[PDB]
Design a protein around this nucleic acid. Sequence first.
DNA 1: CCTGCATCAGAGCCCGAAA
DNA 2: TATAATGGGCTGATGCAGG
RNA 3: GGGGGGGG
Lengths: 263, 210, 346
Amino acid sequence: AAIDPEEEVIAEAEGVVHLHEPASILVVKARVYPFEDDVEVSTGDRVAPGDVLADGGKVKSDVYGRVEVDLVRNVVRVVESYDIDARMGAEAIQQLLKELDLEALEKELLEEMKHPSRARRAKARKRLEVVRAFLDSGNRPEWMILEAVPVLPPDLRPMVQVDGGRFATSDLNDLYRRLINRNNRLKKLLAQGAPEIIIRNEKRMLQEAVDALLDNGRRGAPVTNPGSDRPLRSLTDILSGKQGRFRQNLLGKRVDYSGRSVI
Amino acid sequence: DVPSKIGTLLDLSATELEQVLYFSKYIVLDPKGAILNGVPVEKRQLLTDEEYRELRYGKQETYPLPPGVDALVKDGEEVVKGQELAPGVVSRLDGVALYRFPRRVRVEYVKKERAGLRLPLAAWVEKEAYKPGEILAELPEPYLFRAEEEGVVELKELEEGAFLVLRREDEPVATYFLPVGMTPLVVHGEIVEKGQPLAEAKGLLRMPRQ
Amino acid sequence: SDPVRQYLHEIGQVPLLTLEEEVELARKVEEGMEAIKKLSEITGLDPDLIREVVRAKILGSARVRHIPGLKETLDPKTVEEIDQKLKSLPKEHKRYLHIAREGEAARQHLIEANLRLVVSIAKKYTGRGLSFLDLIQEGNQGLIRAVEKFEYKRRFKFSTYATWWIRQAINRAIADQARTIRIPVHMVETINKLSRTARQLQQELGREPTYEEIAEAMGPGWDAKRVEETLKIAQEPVSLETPIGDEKDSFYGDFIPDEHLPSPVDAATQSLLSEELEKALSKLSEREAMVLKLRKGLIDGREHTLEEVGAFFGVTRERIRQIENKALRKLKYHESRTRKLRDFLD
DNA sequence: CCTGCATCAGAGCCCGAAA
DNA sequence: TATAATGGGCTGATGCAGG
RNA sequence: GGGGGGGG
């Protein structure tokens, strides 16, 4: 078939067809399973050896794999490949920590505490200090990754009109905006079924948005305002240091009813 | 914050925790019986991108053939390690080789015609049917096969052997078959009268390959 | 360890198409959408919902979620039910299921195969307020919709059509996210014009134009006051954390008083006012001061005009307005003695 | 086992500080 | 919505892969 | 990936 009715090749009369001169040859490791009648599994499905493919159950699959229905070659390919669940990101880790019975872990690490070489003694202790820390506290390890990220009250991240009618704004607002864009656009790339290389890229950028909000500069390049080399000041920055919350406004403040002069 | 609290809870190294959080490696939650490089995939193993694709999507490879060069292999043919596929192409994978875009379609049309032929009898081989390459006759000396109608000749040459068709007006008077060892002495579009030699039959006469 | 470099590596994993592979993939995508349209009518279902159900199984169950606009919540229950009706069709009908699913399989590979195109468009749009990766993803988003509307039979190469949608999606992204005070996309288009206009002006005048020279260079409708109010809108906010020069120990935000919360004097002045405000109503009588107090409201502001007063004060309707005055003027003599309220006049 | 060896978080106060 | 365009510009304390 | 003109 082709563009316009012209240039199509129709078969002049009865005959048999041979294919020659390919663009190129693709060798896949798969199994071919021809069919005469209707096919019962559509393309994309994954299947295990012995599963019913076509023709009411006579043809079946030898291998684990995923299905490729050739309607030209009227044969059901199955490319050998597994229903493997392997994940990337915080989504993976959140599961693995959801999936930890800590009392069991404690029991297992205690058993390792009765062991020489002291090194195994030593690291089974450090692990068991975190285990016990969660057990006594009531914290679930899954809480070290966020589903909901909190938003700070606006009067603590103000945007105010200063003398000039100009506006002045706290850095957290730009660190939140970067987060919101990325979350929002990820939401849309999901609904539009984008390839996983694209979804992967945004998912990682989402992490880095969360990581600059919470503790900009901690890992990787510090996010800066456009046309400035100034790291944006993130929540960690606020808390910490000589100019941080503690040392600048909690252990010492400016005061009323005071004054200064030469002596 | 060192040592990572997530890292220690999980017995994941610094590097391992980065790779899965920053989308540089996978970490498996249920291998569903996978196996890679001879060893079954164990839970909590970390696969690179290539590893993940070989286990989740299967292995494959496509090889260019030079323009105009035809393949030493056919569509749907199972291939071994290092089997050769095009004059300069050698596959590095076992599996089912699949044609991509054939530039040349050859459709062999089926034709069933009845055609005639006259030979000596001391020279003919008697049997009820002849199938390709089978010997048809052996002539002690050369015999000249003569036209048995008057007409214009429409010559149709096949790879080996020939067809001859005379006709007056546009109605075919005669359909003759010239096997191998029989070289036509007429050309297409020639007019011939009754009994002009159409072809020389020399020695062994056989039915052609096709 | 570097996020640009890693994505550049991951798109180098997909080989780029040849003209036949490109047209093959494009081919199957469009035929696949025609598949799903006809499957809407056979089925009595909705093309979008069929589109997402076909979509679900090609990608794997990794991705399954509710898609905005679809009538059913898209969970493994409904996609199993909807898939098995799809597979419950005659072989001449269900051949179109197979077409859909390789539709979406080609679309994926067509997208992945053109990711390098987005990079080389996005790299030219650096330094306009969006980060490189933020550009790419917005560019990729255009590529996605260039795949869904490409008509392969016009025989243009895919690069040619996709470039239009990519640049379209990048430049929206810039104009919609780059400003802390987001402003409408066409209004930024006007602002950008003032600057190009001025830059050429300055480029010929050998000095900075005034608003009037811009205004006429902008054509009809533009005067100098409108050049001026356009720029005040274009003004970007500045950071509370800006260092006040010195960079050691000085933030801009530390110089900015809080004018919302009352100061101790103000909060004291407002308390002081209500204190002698009611200690002045009760000193004639509180009843006629209650009528007036009901008129304005110590805490509520109960101020309309004519009507509601028809109800509960104690009297009918025009009398409250009268005792309004007599309370007011008894107040005014009452104040010529207690003249301590003059000071509140500021 | 121990040591190089790497990765991180420290580095005085208050006032003018001329943006 | 359509020529084609396809990979960036100084210290100390502590937890580690390695002689 | 941590830092500066003046006064005490």
